[PDB]
Design a protein around this ligand. Structure first.
Ligand SMILES: [Cu+2]
Ligand SMILES: [Cu+2]
Ligand SMILES: [Cu+2]
Ligand SMILES: [Cu+2]
Lengths: 467, 467
């Protein structure tokens, strides 16, 4: 007679979608086998006065439906003013919170704020270590990343990054190059803690938007110290262990760190045209530098294929493509060498902007975001990861964000977020012939989403090895 | 191969569902033809410091996808402490806002706070007048209801209700009878404004929950004036025009009001066992009284069938049934006689509590809510409104709130809201053989929802004639 939406959910199976909602100030888990939201959480109700719920990542649980834990961070300050919502809050809080929350089989519970426990507030990407024993956050306003311990929320190590332009004027500070310093950040407060919550640390007073390097160069982004900015975005993890990679938007490079010995060991150069790497120079036991002749393009998204064998960093802005290194040699990242660039005619200038990606478990395909400012249709591009070529692009709607995949490989689940004021949805695509099955309602401006992994192997294609 | 969710939405058609989300702080509209959320608004963004978004109702729009306008009010104070979210807020806002919001075919726009325009702040049911030229709001803490003009947001008339118990002890205050006063409530501030925003007016410090009539009796509800409460809930409208009916929870009556002459004309007695009406006595030009020998039962849900020929009030609490009156004589409500009572073996003392309803366009059936405290399954009873009998009950999940219906009469659309901390959903049932088609995600604690009407006729089965 009639069609039952339960038939759609029957095919997706018992996966748990989690996603935060940015200006909605909520986070929510959804049952993809029934269409229910399992639980949601409103941070205002906990006294947060700028609850911009931003990025997030879930630890694996053997049964997400009885329990799971996740990490979700917030942004604050003038970040509240930069989207199209005519916000009337005067003096909002400062965000940079890192909330630990546990779903217990009925409700979500706010465990604590890790930014308080560690001393270190960081407001961009959140990922889980491949061993599920901790997590990392990055922040492009203060240019710090750190890997924290799951059980205590204390920082295992934290790196601060600094730019020293060869030309001291914002228009040229990146294009004509400079030296980046890589600096061990050491705790300064009792108990092993930092003094870097909320805005403490900030160089620029809000996070650079997609294309937002142009803005910083044109002197349109305020802050104390924009000339020193690199805009770190993320620390993503090699699935094989040992190394974590920090992405720096403005200087177009990624830094490979030794997690156990807490040194950086290599710098990979993003733009097509430049070598595989630049030279890392140790200055002292806590200080390294790297010189860059010119920044030919800012980069964004960074991540490893599930087997560890390829590493990717996206050029965005002046170039627009995916640079791929061969990371085959687990024993020494200073050998990792460029082996492929994914290019496509429509990939010119800042838009479409490729800010997020997910591999299929066997690693032969990639789903990658194509973002544009309103009104141009946003979408997904499907990449052949064996030959490194675009297979197809699907237009979907406004403001495309992240992409997650069911662990059996079969369905891609993505979020579009209305720029915080217009249409928002969850999108489902099947990966056998890459077609959209449609949209589920989602009143939230998500800039992240995940499916709760069950095993350490599922994390290799979740929020761990890519953003 | 795969089922597309678009197939389920193709059978629903271009209807727009709207609902607010109570603790979530937000409000959202969904395109039931594509699964997208069309847009959503987070009240914290406009500086509201207790954005419990409560009840709402939408003006008809000839094309809602192009634009439509709605009203959504808030609660604050200690309402924020009444649910199991371990809220930690120091100085919560007082709530009782009445927002005017307009969707402009891209975004939601906050137009203003009707409670600041009028001075009169009310936080329970919001309904639209059948001519779509104004709206009404009730409040069970202050015991006031009013009709507001749509263009100016100024009060057309408002009424204040007061209880004068025969026994001055909260335990007997309603059981052993009393007198209720109906007072015309007049502006005290310049320009025809009230001085009654926020907590001003409050007799008890929070709204009574389902079954909370026993809490007030037991001295569990603090406030300044509990012995005087009646807990007004709503002012629903005869779809034929002329009359509005205010429901009074604690004394178990409804008062019929003549909208244009600004006087009450009749009082309907809810519990089975009592006559059709108690006698309204005029005291002076602004004051009427009505005596009740004893209150056998509190009531709650109240509303008209779409042709106006039947009027319903739900006994909850000490009886649990639907009382029905013959309202076919539109010239004189003092002739409305009880004509039936719907009863069911399971409907004994408070739970399930039947607090929400919607009619089919032809008025031949009613979908009514059945609410229990966690953990018993809440759901929907289907009522034969030709013979006044229950047809079936369907169990759904936690915390069942309101129901709407598509104006072609084909699909019933309801909200479950997880007691603000667990599972939430929208549910879809087809009215042809009353089977549930399944659930769409909705991370929101809705106590309201509407499908946006397109004509005046549509309002006869929207938030106008029933809550
Ligand atoms: Cu990023
Ligand atoms: Cu973001
Ligand atoms: Cu009610
Ligand atoms: Cu309510």
């Amino acid at each position: 007679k009639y069609v039952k939406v339960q038939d759609f959910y029957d095919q997706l199976g018992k996966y748990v979608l989690v996603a935060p909602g940015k200006f909605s100030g909520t986070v929510a888990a959804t049952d993809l086998s029934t269409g229910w939201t399992m639980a949601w959480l409103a941070a205002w109700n906990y006294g947060d006065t700028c609850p911009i719920m931003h990025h997030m990542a879930a630890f694996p649980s053997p049964d997400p439906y009885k329990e799971f834990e996740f990490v979700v961070n917030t942004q604050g300050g003038k970040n509240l003013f930069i989207y199209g919502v005519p916000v009337t809050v005067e003096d909002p809080g400062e965000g940079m919170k890192i909330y630990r929350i546990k779903y217990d089989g009925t409700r979500m519970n706010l465990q604590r704020d890790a930014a308080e426990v560690s001393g270190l507030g960081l407001g961009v990407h959140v990922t889980i270590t491949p061993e599920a024993d901790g997590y990392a956050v990055g922040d492009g306003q203060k240019d710090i990343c750190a890997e924290f311990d799951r059980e205590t929320d204390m920082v295992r190590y934290a790196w601060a990054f600094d730019w020293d332009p060869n030309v001291k004027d914002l228009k040229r500070a990146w294009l004509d190059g400079g030296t980046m310093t890589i600096k061990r950040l050491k705790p300064t407060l009792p108990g092993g803690r930092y003094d870097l919550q909320g805005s403490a640390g900030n160089k620029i007073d809000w996070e650079l938007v997609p294309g937002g390097e142009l803005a910083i160069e044109d002197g349109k982004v305020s802050g104390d110290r924009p000339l020193h900015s690199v805009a770190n975005d993320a620390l993503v993890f090699d699935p094989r262990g040992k190394w974590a990679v920090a992405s720096m938007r403005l200087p177009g490079v990624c830094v490979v760190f030794d997690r156990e010995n807490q040194v950086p060991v290599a710098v990979l150069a993003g733009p097509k045209g430049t070598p595989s790497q630049f030279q890392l120079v140790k200055v002292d036991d806590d200080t390294w530098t790297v010189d860059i002749p010119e920044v030919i393009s800012a980069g964004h998204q960074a991540g490893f294929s599930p087997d560890g064998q390829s590493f990717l960093f996206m050029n965005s802005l002046r170039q627009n493509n995916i640079m791929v290194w061969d990371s085959s040699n687990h024993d020494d990242p200073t050998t990792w060498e460029k082996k492929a660039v994914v290019e496509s005619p429509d990939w010119r200038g800042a838009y479409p902007n490729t800010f997020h990606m997910v591999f299929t478990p066997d690693a032969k395909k990639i789903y990658v975001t194509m973002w544009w400012p309103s009104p141009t249709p946003n979408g997904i591009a499907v990449i052949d990861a064996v030959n490194w070529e675009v297979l197809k692009e699907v237009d979907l709607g406004p403001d495309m964000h992240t992409l997650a995949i069911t662990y059996d490989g079969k369905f891609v689940v993505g979020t579009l977020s209305g720029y915080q004021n217009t249409a928002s949805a969850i999108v489902v695509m099947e990966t056998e012939t890459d077609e959209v099955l449609g949209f589920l309602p989602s009143p939230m401006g998500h800039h992240d989403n995940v499916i709760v992994p069950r095993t350490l192997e599922d994390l290799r294609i979740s929020r761990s090895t890519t953003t």
